[PDB]
Structures are given as structure tokens and as C-alpha cells.
A paper describes a structure:
Here we describe the characterization of two DARPins generated against the oligomerization domain and the SAM domain of the transcription factor p73, a member of the p53 protein family. For the development of target-specific protein-based binders, Designed Ankyrin Repeat Proteins (DARPins) are well suited, as these proteins are small (14-18 kDa), highly stable and, in contrast to antibodies and nanobodies, they do not contain disulfide bonds, making it possible to use them in the reducing cellular environment without reducing their stability. For further structural understanding of the interaction of the DARPins with their target domains, we solved the X-ray crystal structure of both DARPins in complex with their respective target domains.
Out of this initial screen, DARPin 1800 was selected as binder for the p73 OD and DARPin B9 as binder for the p73 SAM domain. We also solved a high-resolution crystal structure of DARPin B9 in complex with the p73 SAM domain, which showed a 1:1 stoichiometry, as is also indicated by the ITC measurements. The interaction interface is mainly located within helix 1 and helix 2 of the p73 SAM domain. Additional contacts are formed between some N-terminal residues as well as helix 5 of the p73 SAM domain and the DARPin. The selectivity relative to the p63 SAM domain is mediated by hydrophobic contacts to a variety of non-conserved residues throughout the SAM domain, including P491, G499, P503, Y537 and T540. In the case of DARPin B9 the affinity was increased from 309 nM (which is within this multi-domain construct significantly higher than the KD measured for the isolated SAM domain) to 64 nM for the leucine zipper construct DARPin B9 LZ and to 46 nM for the linear fusion construct B9-B9. A similar effect was observed for the B9-SPOP fusion.
Author numbering:
A (entry chain A): 4 to 64
B (entry chain B): 3 to 100, 102 to 159
Amino acid sequence: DPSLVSFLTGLGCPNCIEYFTSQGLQSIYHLQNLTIEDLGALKIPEQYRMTIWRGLQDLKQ
Amino acid sequence: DLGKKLLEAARAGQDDEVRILMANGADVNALDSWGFTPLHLAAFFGHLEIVEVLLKTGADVNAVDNAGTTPLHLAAHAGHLEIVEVLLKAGADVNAHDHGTVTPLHLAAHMGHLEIVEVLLKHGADVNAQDKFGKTPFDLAIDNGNEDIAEVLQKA
């Protein structure tokens, strides 16, 4: 889904997209409720992990 | 409403409905909840005839979504060479960058799109552009073992 491509582009880690799509997570909706623990389980390098997590929290209300 | 149905038609490749909905009063630059325009969606999903119809009808070639991504970003990522060429001819910003400071060339490099990498280079794409994590198009072509692109990116 372009929302996931665009999200990761906006954050600076387009190279992180395969960590999500390899688990069949295709859209920003599919990420919205992942935990810090979940992002580690996906084997996202710590370089990028918390940047992605904060980005997901910024989308919530 | 008209704008939502136009975004849906552009995504889905429904070229008649795209033409009809705009004539009926859909804004060519209607937004979805991510800030995508119909042009963003047509560019990502490879619908060249729809890209052309939207540009003719006044689509903003450099529209940014809520994360600062342009149609050229999406077409380059998705490997749609004919769309990338049509957007560049229509004045797409070759080095558009967002917070992440990621350019279309970064995405073409990462996804292994050789011909798009070359076309972007020919329109003055910045080989020196670093993302927020200091990675250049070159860095992402290496990290992904895209050898031909990494090569062409040194070549400039």
C-alpha cells in the first residue's frame, strides 16, 4: 500500500519496508498498534526502531 | 462523495469513472486521509492513461501527502518508468524531500530500478543526497546489493 511506502519515506527509513511486508504488513493501518517489543521481534535495527515507534504514536488520538 | 470516488477510481485504474467524476465536480486534487491525491495513487499503481488525464485536468504534479511524499517518489519506488518520465516532463521536482530528507532517487536505488535511476540522474538527481540516517542512494544500493545501480551512482 502506498501509505506504508510514504510513512517510512517521511521518517527516513524506506530501507525498513521489507521488515513489515515480509510479515504481510502492507498498509499504515497494519502497523498502527505494533509495540516497541513487536518492532524488535520484526528485527528492525535500533538505529531505526524508536523513530518508527514514535512516528506510529504521532498518528494516534 | 465525488472526491472519495475519484481517489478510488484512480487507485483502481477505472479511467472512464476518472473522466466522468471530474466532469461531475470532483477536485482533480481531492485528498484521502493520508493526503494522497488521485495522481499519487495512479502513479503508485501504474495507471499511465489516468496519470495523463489527471495532469491534463490540472493535477498538482508536486502535491505532497501528510508525510511529504510526491507522486514521483511513489512511481520511482514502484518502478513505473513511463510514469516517472511523464511526471518529469510535467515538471515533477526531481529532488523533492520531506524530516527523513528522502529523495525519489533513494527509493529507485533501494527497489533496484536501474532505468529510473538513470532517468532521475539525467534530470539532475542529487547522488550526494543523504536521508536522516546519513544514507545516500549509493548506500541503499549497497545495503541491498544492487551492484549495477551502485556502479552507475559512482559513474556520477
